[PDB]
Amino acid sequence: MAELILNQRPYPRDLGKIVCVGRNYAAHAKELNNPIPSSPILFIKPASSAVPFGPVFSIPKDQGSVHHELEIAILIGKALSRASTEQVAESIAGIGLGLDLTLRDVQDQLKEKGHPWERAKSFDGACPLTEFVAVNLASEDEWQAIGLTLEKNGQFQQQGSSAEMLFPILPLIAHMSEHFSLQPGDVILTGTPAGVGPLEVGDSLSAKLSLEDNVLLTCDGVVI
Amino acid sequence: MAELILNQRPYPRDLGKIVCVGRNYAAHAKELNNPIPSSPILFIKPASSAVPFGPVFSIPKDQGSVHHELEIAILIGKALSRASTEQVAESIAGIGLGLDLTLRDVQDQLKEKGHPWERAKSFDGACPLTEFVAVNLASEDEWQAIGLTLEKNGQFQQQGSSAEMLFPILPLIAHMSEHFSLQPGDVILTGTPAGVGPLEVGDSLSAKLSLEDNVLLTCDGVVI
């Protein structure tokens, strides 16, 4: 599986699990004709689904539509269990980006039957993940200033700010830790903004992570 | 973090992920009035949900009923991806028991809304796992002669044999391997038979695992 990268070198703890939120951005719930949540939808992707974020993304081939979903990724550095938001902020080792790659037709069918989502979310290559970068934020306020951008084939595809999250980063993770204890090496996917859509072989993607409109990292890849 | 025991001694792998099958015993499907699918219901529990199988089983408190679901657990010894039944049999390092503890009321509501199952299946303590007993160059059909029994406060509660499985151990695991690559230290929960029901604080459980009618493990615990 591993490792994760933090500050351009290997993170000392192997990738554990990838805890994900559904529908953290209102416009993304609307674009798919889903009801905006009042509590978060929670699922988990396994270490076996992680791959480097580019230069190539391999997608499943004969299983219907495969969707890109860019999301702010959070690396957990210290164990969290039933944690406060202060404990969460002190635990975060860095921030990066992930693609929550989703077999969308498979998900539609799973959902309709009330079935678990793993077939659509946990497949090999389901979680391209960038390197993480340590940020020592000036106030808890600044967690609301994190941005993401996806471009596909040179053109705008997705953009979001953590300001827009229904469940902001710190309280989301604090709440997550109430349901599943979090260990060092765990990753959090904080939700995809509007603009999700299918991927085809040969699509090129360009992903950008920012802080108050300053670029933290950029990562590119082509679909194969 | 719960750690794997093979051969009454430590195992050189950390517990990875716990891959589970939904409705593998026709009778368990029926007792709950659930349709039998022609394809396996697949979900995954995280390493972080595993705990020792006894002497205590802790259960969530204010989230409705918690069901016991005894199942035959399979310890994956060698990597498996897109694998055949022969490779599966060579990869297996041993066999044990797991309790797929389940927030049934939470699971009912998630099903209704078409939400992922993690809240109901992946909470802390959701996966009590016994030690594993090594099986080596087993007879190619001893795989249909594994039995399990659960007792609850002295009375039989669950009983079954891998002969009764809709998706038999080897091709079930081969099939999982087509969707999620399996790494050494991953555990497979092969489905629970008829007899599921709630657990209450003070309940005591006794679980047995057999191979060709010879008991291999007896593990007890009380619910707290």
Ligand SMILES: [Zn+2]
């Ligand atoms: Zn909660």
Ligand SMILES: [Zn+2]
């Ligand atoms: Zn997502």
Ligand SMILES: [Zn+2]
């Ligand atoms: Zn089960």
